[PDB]
């Protein structure tokens, strides 16, 4: 039992799409407004998040089948899953050692206390780290990590999605490649699939909590003014 | 012939208001997105401009009589004159020697070529510098420079102004202090007043040109996304 051309081709695409949109050296972080340690980290983290959304969009545009959806659904899937994809890809910089996202020097080393100064509370930050840790422990292959992100982004159950039937199909196709892959290429991965699909659920809670906390933040003009047009658009409530 | 209490008090207020909202060391510039030398300077200059609008607002709120206008007129006067006030106060950093705005090191030294990389053309940049030079040559006192800015901001002829009659009055009162001051405290200042009022006219042209160039820029989402919420709001066309 082994992978098929179509499946494997979907893997070369996602892994290439990820490499093309994720720098393991975080060299672009100096172009962000400097981090500062009432919401002093907000400017820098807003720029980090905005930067990441741009990358998620680049990645999405290269997930097989996504480019064919209507512009509306692409936006619906993007707006709704953006924050989850960010949390996923962020794991790649997370460190179980220092329980933080290490992106270079002491400057770009992000701790919970840091996100607290960007307007977020432990209510969100607690499970975030808990999730980061659990996800790290899965020691996922790049193929499974990139597949989990493509799968999460094509979740058919997102507010605003129209053609939720095709979306549901593309997601299943991917869910299939991930399953085959784990079985064929990943040892002891007998129960990994379930753990990966489980992770998607934890993301909805984190997503929801973030939505609330972000809503409050965005309502206060002295704070929303620190955000970027893209963040305001992707997380905003405009229909 | 000498100044009166009321007049002189208006001067202590404006000069204090300016000091409280203008740092001659430009120490906050490091918190802006770094400058970079297709519109690479846009991020840094957007942050410079946004930063300056916040300062102009702080200054405006301290111009005598402004705090009494309706919130709408304050906004109308602000939206319409913001860019002109910026150009005025910027002179304080302009250097006739290097024909630029020197705000620290080679980084924060702004040349025309720089504003070109922020989306603006010589059509605007040419008169800007020409204006900067002419204004510099006036070797204005801080009292006259701060008065010229308060006067410019209370221009009754701004699109959107409602109670244009009271505005017109506050402006005249200021125009009076500036006149008295020049006569009493400024030698050879016999023809300075006319030169100062003349400067207000050059600002309308610069303002107009900027409005056009900014409009084009703002229409291109790949560019407006580099702007800040405040810039989009103050220069935007929302009614």
């Amino acid at each position: 039992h082994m992978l098929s051309d179509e499946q494997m081709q979907i893997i070369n695409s996602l892994v290439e799409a990820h490499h093309k949109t994720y720098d393991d050296s975080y060299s672009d972080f100096v172009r962000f407004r400097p981090p500062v340690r009432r919401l002093s980290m907000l400017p820098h983290l807003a720029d980090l998040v905005s930067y990441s959304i741009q990358k998620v969009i680049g990645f999405a545009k290269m997930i097989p089948g996504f480019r064919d959806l209507t512009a509306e659904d692409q936006i619906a899937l993007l707006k709704s899953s953006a924050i989850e994809i960010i949390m996923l890809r962020s794991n790649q910089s997370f460190s179980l050692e220092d329980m933080s996202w290490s992106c270079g020097g002491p400057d770009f080393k992000y701790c919970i206390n840091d996100v607290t100064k960007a307007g977020h509370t432990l209510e969100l930050l607690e499970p975030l780290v808990k999730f980061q840790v659990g996800l790290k422990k899965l020691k996922l292959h790049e193929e499974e990590h990139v597949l989990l992100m493509a799968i999460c982004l094509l979740s058919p159950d997102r507010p605003g999605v129209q053609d939720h039937v095709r979306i549901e199909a593309l997601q299943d196709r991917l869910c299939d490649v991930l399953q085959a892959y784990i079985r064929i290429q990943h040892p002891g991965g007998r129960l990994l699939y379930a753990k990966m699909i489980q992770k998607l659920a934890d993301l909805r809670s984190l997503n929801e909590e973030h939505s609330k906390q972000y809503r409050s933040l965005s309502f206060q003009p002295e704070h929303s003014m620190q955000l970027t047009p893209l963040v305001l658009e992707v997380f905003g409530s405009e229909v | 012939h000498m100044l009166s209490d009321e007049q002189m008090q208006i001067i202590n207020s404006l000069v204090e208001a300016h000091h409280k909202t203008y740092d001659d060391s430009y120490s906050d510039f490091v918190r802006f997105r770094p400058p970079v030398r297709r519109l690479s300077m846009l991020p840094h200059l957007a942050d410079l401009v946004s930063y300056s609008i916040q300062k102009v607002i702080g200054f405006a709120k301290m111009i005598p009589g402004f705090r009494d206008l309706t919130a709408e007129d304050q906004i109308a006067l602000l939206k319409s004159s913001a860019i002109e006030i910026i150009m005025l106060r910027s002179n304080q950093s302009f250097s006739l020697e290097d024909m630029s705005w020197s705000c620290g090191g080679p980084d924060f030294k702004y040349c025309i070529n720089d504003v070109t990389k922020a989306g603006h053309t010589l059509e605007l940049l040419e008169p800007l510098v020409k204006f900067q030079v002419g204004l510099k040559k006036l070797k204005l006192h801080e009292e006259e420079h701060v008065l010229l800015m308060a006067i410019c901001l209370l221009s009754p002829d701004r699109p959107g102004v409602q109670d244009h009659v009271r505005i017109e009055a506050l402006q005249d009162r200021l125009c009076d202090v500036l006149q008295a001051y020049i006569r009493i405290q400024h030698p050879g200042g016999r023809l300075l007043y006319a030169k100062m009022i003349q400067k207000l006219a050059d600002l309308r042209s610069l303002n107009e040109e900027h409005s056009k160039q900014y409009r084009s820029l703002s229409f291109q989402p790949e560019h407006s996304m580099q702007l800040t919420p405040l810039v989009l709001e103050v220069f935007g066309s929302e009614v």
Partner: peptide, 10 residues
């Protein structure tokens, strides 16, 4: 609106 998102998606 979603003018920015539209554009980024080419």
């Amino acid at each position: 609106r979603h003018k920015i998102l539209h554009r980024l998606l080419q």
